[PDB]
Design an enzyme around this catalytic site. Structure first.
Site, PDB file in Angstrom:
ATOM      1  N   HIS A 146       0.742  -1.263   0.000  1.00  0.00           N
ATOM      2  CA  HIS A 146       0.000   0.000   0.000  1.00  0.00           C
ATOM      3  C   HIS A 146       0.771   1.311   0.000  1.00  0.00           C
ATOM      4  O   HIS A 146       0.268   2.318  -0.494  1.00  0.00           O
ATOM      5  CB  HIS A 146      -0.988   0.020   1.166  1.00  0.00           C
ATOM      6  CG  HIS A 146      -2.363   0.464   0.780  1.00  0.00           C
ATOM      7  ND1 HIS A 146      -2.594   1.501  -0.098  1.00  0.00           N
ATOM      8  CD2 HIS A 146      -3.582   0.018   1.166  1.00  0.00           C
ATOM      9  CE1 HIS A 146      -3.896   1.675  -0.236  1.00  0.00           C
ATOM     10  NE2 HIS A 146      -4.519   0.787   0.518  1.00  0.00           N
ATOM     11  N   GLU A 184     -33.205   3.596 -10.828  1.00  0.00           N
ATOM     12  CA  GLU A 184     -33.925   4.330  -9.798  1.00  0.00           C
ATOM     13  C   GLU A 184     -33.409   5.759  -9.679  1.00  0.00           C
ATOM     14  O   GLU A 184     -33.874   6.525  -8.840  1.00  0.00           O
ATOM     15  CB  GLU A 184     -33.779   3.623  -8.449  1.00  0.00           C
ATOM     16  CG  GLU A 184     -34.627   2.381  -8.296  1.00  0.00           C
ATOM     17  CD  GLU A 184     -36.102   2.696  -8.363  1.00  0.00           C
ATOM     18  OE1 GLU A 184     -36.527   3.684  -7.723  1.00  0.00           O
ATOM     19  OE2 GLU A 184     -36.839   1.956  -9.044  1.00  0.00           O
TER      20      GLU A 184
END
Ligand SMILES: CC(C)(COP(=O)(O)OP(=O)(O)OC[C@H]1O[C@@H](n2cnc3c(N)ncnc32)[C@H](O)[C@@H]1OP(=O)(O)O)[C@@H](O)C(=O)NCCC(=O)NCCS
Ligand SMILES: CCCCCC(=O)O[C@H](CC(=O)O)C[N+](C)(C)C
Length: 599
Positions: free
Chosen positions: A317, A399
């Site tokens: 990371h 939606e």
């Protein structure tokens, strides 16, 4: 990256002090008590008063932004990773599960590995030539710096803090990768003399030699040392490299463009836990008796190719974030699907150098201690892989709702249903629209989400009324997301104010020692979305002992989910959380479908 592009990018801004503090107070309301909130409210007013502490710290941050390319860059990298002393395995290095391949024999496995390597080298060509396409987010150009941090790099153990080495731009850039088979590392040149990259067929031939040079797993899994605590590994590392040969092997590994792990066959397991075991294999290796010793976790990029067809990767990371990594994956995977052309008879090739290691009684002891440590870590990790086939971005979009926000709101609903209360929730937000930008925090627990989860489980609230609350929560989350990617979030800002206070040599501001802040920063839910064309999914361990690590990849018709937890906390259960999340998503769809808007 391409300095021209980078220079035209806006610099990471410093949000207004009073603005961030206001957002902070709002995000706290749903996760702290009224008494605690009232106290924090008082600390905030004092903290931001004219001529106060906050104002001076804020001024300091604005000055910091004027004398640096990114006022947050070094601080973040340092506090989030380089100074994080826990093992990088599970707790830091994200894992990725890629679509299982169809090879059924050794030649097939090595065939895919060769194709994968070639695909990576192909992607690398764009990086070296700075031709990598510009990306956008929210309609804004994105920083490409991360792409020049993933290849030919490696993390380095430090007694106090770790460091990172990058040779992508060294006098003579590395032209070799490292291959690990049965715990044995090999140095493999993937470029010819003229400078052209080897072909997939050529790489395959080399992998065969490598595979036959390490047919038995009798050598010590020296690489397992990279999974121990950073303080311990720092010391074990320093000893390890006292030998000329050892130091030479390590140097080769650190400089290698990237590492390819040829994992051995593992004990067949039940079909209901198979995917969870493959996720563990990609995250930690399974154990010292499996493939955990067939790795080098300090290496920025590790691609794993299982014997049973499974494949994936794990990356350090400190280098980059998710998007850059997945971008490389999508390209590599799409490359392995490309047909073959020139099958001309390739010319002879040299024998890949074997990076040997001289083991000593002390090194042996270190390896055993690492095995013990890793065994404990794995035993405590609870993983649950959930493939939500019901639907994907398709429904939320139909939606007129943000899919990610829809998913986040569903997670809040699921959590409330289980614990009866909201909790500090973290969702990764990309700040790449700013030079060297990494990430900020989107807080999924809010006033609107809590109002929704409450009204949702309220058998006295009109079903149609729950619909309004649902859309409002989603919209609220979408608004927070838009502010976060535009540098309007407050988490990194507040962190900056605290580090600034430390740097200014002033007493730690009460606001940072406040219980509310501790709660707000204790993420029982640590999440992130990993958008990708490839049907893959990422995963990572929770950030706190009593929390969950949730990662997902929203596809069009389905959503890949990964849920992690620790067995040390009886209050958490990966499978259970995954089930409530699945049900939460479905119930929200049901609610919305039961009450259409169009007429
Ligand atoms: C927070 C974040 C993930 C949101 O991404 P996003 O793309 O806005 O997610 P959304 O769900 O809103 O949008 C996804 C899709 O739904 C659509 N959509 C969103 N809102 C919509 C709406 N109201 N109506 C219809 N469609 C909508 C989008 O157009 C998009 O369409 P696509 O499938 O054609 O691309 C992103 O801004 C970010 O920061 N990503 C980086 C995360 C990271 O760093 N991860 C790794 C950490 S190491
Ligand atoms: C394959 C990578 C999947 C995402 C990993 C991720 O989200 O890392 C986060 C980075 C950040 O938000 O700064 C940290 N986190 C795992 C603790 C959420």
């Amino acid at each position: 990256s391409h300095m021209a592009h980078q220079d035209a990018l806006p610099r990471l801004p410093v949000p207004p002090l009073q603005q961030s503090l206001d957002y902070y107070l709002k995000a706290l309301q749903p996760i702290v008590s009224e008494e605690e909130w009232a106290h924090t409210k008082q600390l905030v007013d004092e903290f931001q008063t004219s001529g106060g502490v906050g104002e001076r710290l804020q001024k300091g941050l604005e000055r910091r932004a004027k004398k640096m390319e990114n006022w947050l860059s070094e601080w973040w990298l340092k506090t989030a990773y380089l100074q994080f002393r826990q093992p990088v395995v599970i707790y830091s290095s994200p894992g990725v599960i890629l679509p299982k391949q169809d090879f059924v024999d050794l030649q097939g496995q090595l065939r895919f590995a060769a194709k994968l390597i070639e695909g990576v080298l192909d992607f690398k060509s764009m990086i070296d030539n700075e031709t990598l396409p510009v990306e956008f987010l929210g309609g804004q150009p994105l920083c490409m710096n991360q792409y020049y941090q993933i290849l030919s790099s490696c993390r380095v153990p430090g007694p106090k803090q770790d460091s990172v080495v990058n040779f992508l731009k060294s006098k003579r850039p590395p032209t070799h990768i490292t291959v690990v088979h049965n715990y044995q590392f090999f140095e493999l040149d993937v470029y010819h003399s003229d400078g052209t990259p080897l072909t997939s067929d050529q790489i395959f031939v080399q992998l065969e030699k490598i595979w036959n040079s390490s047919l038995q797993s009798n050598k010590e899994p020296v690489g397992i040392l990279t999974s121990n605590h950073r303080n311990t590994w720092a010391k074990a590392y320093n000893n390890l490299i006292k030998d000329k040969v050892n130091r030479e092997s390590v140097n080769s590994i650190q400089k290698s463009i990237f590492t390819v792990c040829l994992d051995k066959q593992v004990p067949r397991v039940s079909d209901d836990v198979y995917r969870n075991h493959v996720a563990g294999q990609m995250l930690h290796g399974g154990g010292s008796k499996f493939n955990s010793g067939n790795r080098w976790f300090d290496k920025t990029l590790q691609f794993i190719v299982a014997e049973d067809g499974s494949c994936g990767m794990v990356y350090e990371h400190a280098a980059a974030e998710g998007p850059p990594i997945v971008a490389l994956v999508d390209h590599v995977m799409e490359y392995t699907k490309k047909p073959e052309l020139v099958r001309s008879p390739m010319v002879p090739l040299p024998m890949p150098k074997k990076l040997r290691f001289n083991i000593t009684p002390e090194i042996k002891n270190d390896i055993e201690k690492a095995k013990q440590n890793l065994s404990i870590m794995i035993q405590d990790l609870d993983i649950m892989m959930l493939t939500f086939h019901h639907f994907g971005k398709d429904f939320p979009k139909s939606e007129k709702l943000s899919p990610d926000a829809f998913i986040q709101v569903a997670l809040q609903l699921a959590y409330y249903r289980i614990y009866g209360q909201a909790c500090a929730t973290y969702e990764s937000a990309s700040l790449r629209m700013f030079h060297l930008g990494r990430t900020d925090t989107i807080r999924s627990a809010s006033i609107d989400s809590l109002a929704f989860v409450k009204g949702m489980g309220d058998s006295t609230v009109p079903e149609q009324q729950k619909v309004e609350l649902l859309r409002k929560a989603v919209q609220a989350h979408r608004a927070y997301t838009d502010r976060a990617i535009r540098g309007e979030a407050f988490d990194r800002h507040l962190l900056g104010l605290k580090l600034q206070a430390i740097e200014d040599l002033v007493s730690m501001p009460d606001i940072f020692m406040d219980t509310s802040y501790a709660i707000a920063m204790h993420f029982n839910l640590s999440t992130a979305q990993v958008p990708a064309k490839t049907d893959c999914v990422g995963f990572f361990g929770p950030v706190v002992p009593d929390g969950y690590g949730i990662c997902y990849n929203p596809m069009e018709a389905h959503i890949n989910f990964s849920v992690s937890a620790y067995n040390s906390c009886a209050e958490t259960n990966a499978a259970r959380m995954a089930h409530y999340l699945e049900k939460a998503l479905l119930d929200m769809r049901t609610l919305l479908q039961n009450h259409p808007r169009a007429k």
